[PDB]
Design a binder for this molecule. Structure first.
Ligand SMILES: CCCC(=O)Nc1cc(NS(=O)(=O)c2cccs2)cc(-c2csc(=O)[nH]2)c1
Length: 124
């Protein structure tokens, strides 16, 4: 019931490093990672472990911060916007799979606010 986790490397896809991407790893991701509500989002959802047998029946573009971290470490992204889209997909997936007011959704909401605070201004 678990598909393979999202790719963190792809030899068909060009790599890049930018000041913004470096910041996304060093500052944004590594700070969000330490937040008290980061733990549900540090790895791909394991539907067997977590007893969420419909997770991947609902969520067709899964994403998590562990994957994002590995992508940043591997220079998988072309630019910061591509990485930002992955965070936004992670947050949106949470709102889609769950319901307003759920504890997991309150966690995602808090992390998304902090994320927006940190990406409001990126290095030039
Ligand atoms: C494997 C590390 C622990 C973990 O991630 N647990 C967990 C439990 C659960 N189920 S739970 O009832 O224990 C829970 C409720 C509030 C935070 S976790 C869900 C998720 C989840 C991540 S994204 C998403 O939509 N859900 C994650």
């Amino acid at each position: 019931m678990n598909p393979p986790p999202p790719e963190t490397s792809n030899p068909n896809k060009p790599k890049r490093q930018t000041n913004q991407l470096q910041y996304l790893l060093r500052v944004v991701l590594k700070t969000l990672w330490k937040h008290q509500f980061a733990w549900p989002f540090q790895q791909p959802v394991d539907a067997v472990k977590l007893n969420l047998p419909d997770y991947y029946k609902i969520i067709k573009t899964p994403m998590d911060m562990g994957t994002i971290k590995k992508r940043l470490e591997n220079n998988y992204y072309w630019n910061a916007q591509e990485c930002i889209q992955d965070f936004n997909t992670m947050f949106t997936n949470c709102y889609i799979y769950n319901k307003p007011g759920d504890d997991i959704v309150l966690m995602a909401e808090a992390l998304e606010k902090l994320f927006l605070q940190k990406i409001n201004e990126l290095p030039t």
